[PDB]
Every structure is written in structure tokens, then in C-alpha cells.
């Protein structure tokens, strides 16, 4: 097993996966690491098993059809994983916790959004469709672009959104296009 958390790259109280060499802090893993369960398989292993059980799940999909899927167990798991992939980028720190807005020449967004709020929403099963989750995720970056305007800090929103969008396309096997 690794000696650092796969998500935040720090040592600490880690839980180790029984089917691969990754380790996690308790609340870095999504869902939070389960109390008992021996053996324990992490989210990366569980996502890999889904593909192995149904190889055709990797054939290309249209984004519009993906978004309308109901949040059944396997879609729930894929959203958890995609959220996890965002938290794996160190730049996610800027978007994790509840923001505030007081900048000369800007007004705060009508609907603030942050990664820990989306984490809670998934945990409490508040999204009925994939679209719910993806809308909130995109809203995080949109709110950041609009607020920071021409400050170069707007780029952080672009950069973390690109991580989100690449992972979305990979996890949900969106049809490759030019
Ligand atoms: Zn961690
Ligand atoms: Zn694993
Ligand atoms: Zn099959």
C-alpha cells in the first residue's frame, strides 16, 4: 500500500484498499471510508469492476442522454468518483468551502456553490438525475468566472473546470469528437 493519501497526497491516518495499492484518509475517500468491511475495495476498484462486468459501457455516449440518467447506484458511484477526481487536484482547495463575495466592482452570484456542498448533497441523495450533479459542478466554475472578471485569478476556475470536464468525458464514456 501507498504511504500517502491518493487524494490530498499527505500522510496521516490512512485506510488501505485490499484490492489495489491506494490509501485514503477517512473523509478524502468518497463515500467516507466504511467502518468495517473486510476486505475493503476503494472507489477506483469499484469503478473498474463496473467496466469489467459490462465492457460495452465504454462505447461512446451522448452527453444529453448521460445527463438524463437517474441516479441509480452505478450512476451515484460514478458521480462520487468524478467529484473525487476534482478533489485530487490541489487547486480544488479554492472551491472546497463556502465562499464569500466582497470585491470592488463585482456582485456575488445569485446561487453560491462549492465542492463540500456538492459532497453533502451526494451523500444525502439529493440528486435524482446525473444532470443535478453536473449542473452544480459547472455552477461552481461559472460563478467564479463571473465574479473575478478580468482578474487573472479567473484562470483557476478554467483550470479546475478542465479537470472536471476531462474526467466527466472519461468516466461516463462520452463519444469522442473533433
Ligand atoms: Zn487525504
Ligand atoms: Zn482500490
Ligand atoms: Zn453486459
What's the gist of this structure?
By secondary structure, this protein is mainly α. The protein has seven helices and two strands.
Keywords summarizing the entry:
transcription, monomer, binds zinc ion, PanDDA, mainly alpha, 178 residues, Histone Acetyltransferase, Chain A, 7 helices, Herpes Virus-1, 2 domains
CATH structural class of the largest domain: Mainly Alpha
User: Based on helices, strands and strand pairing, what is the structural class?
Assistant: mainly alpha
Q: What is the end-to-end distance?
A: 39 Å
CATH architectural designation of the largest domain: Up-down Bundle
Proportion in helices: 40-55%
Q: What number of structural domains do the residues give? A: 2
- Per the CATH scheme, the topology name of the largest domain is Histone Acetyltransferase, Chain A
Number of helices: 7
Largest sheet: 2 strands, antiparallel
CATH superfamily of the largest domain: Bromodomain-like
Number of strands: 2
Radius of gyration, CA atoms, in whole angstroms? 17 Å
Give helix and strand order, one letter per element, not per position: EEHHHHHHH
Q: Per the principal axes of the C-alpha atoms, what is the gross shape?
A: globular
> Largest beta sheet: what is the strand line-up?
1-2
Which band does the percent of strand residues land in? Answer: under 5%
Bound molecules: zinc ion
Your description of this structure?
With 178 residues, the protein is an all-alpha fold. It has a two-stranded antiparallel ribbon with strand order 1-2. Helix 1 packs across helix 3 and helix 3 runs antiparallel to helix 7. The longest helix is centred in the last third of the chain and has 19 residues. Bound molecules: zinc ion (ZN) (3 copies). One zinc ion binds next to helix 1.
